[PDB]
Amino acid sequence: KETAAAKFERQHMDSSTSAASSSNYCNQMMKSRNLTKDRCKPVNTFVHESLADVQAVCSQKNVACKNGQTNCYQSYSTMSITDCRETGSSKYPNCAYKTTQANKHIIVACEGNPYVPVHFDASV
Length: 124
Known about the structure:
Oligomer: monomer
CATH class: Alpha Beta
Binding site for substrate: 7, 10, 41-45, 66, 85
GO molecular function, one term: RNA nuclease activity
Helix content: 10-25%
Largest sheet: 4 strands, antiparallel
EC number: 4.6.1.18
GO biological process, one term: defense response to Gram-positive bacterium
Shape: globular
Subunit structure: Interacts with and forms tight 1:1 complexes with RNH1. Dimerization of two such complexes may occur. Interaction with RNH1 inhibits this protein. Monomer.
């Protein structure tokens, strides 16, 4: 709620645009969220849905995390997602991404307090 909810918002949140059609998006985003910082992660998904829409999920379909379980909630319908896929090659500041845009549903974990998503599990 002070580093977790943040961490999630840092990596997975982007409620400034409905979608993302371009490798521009991915490349700038990973850079902007400093996700390339130190070592850029292979793959990363960004939700293009309102932060509230995403918290809402915390009280929707109760599912099984890809680990422990429940405390995992699945988005009723379909979310505007963008997948960031690493490309180029070379374990170093060389990080390029390709932008794949999907329409999938999300599986999140929530630490309520009021409710706040903290861990983005599977993206379908």
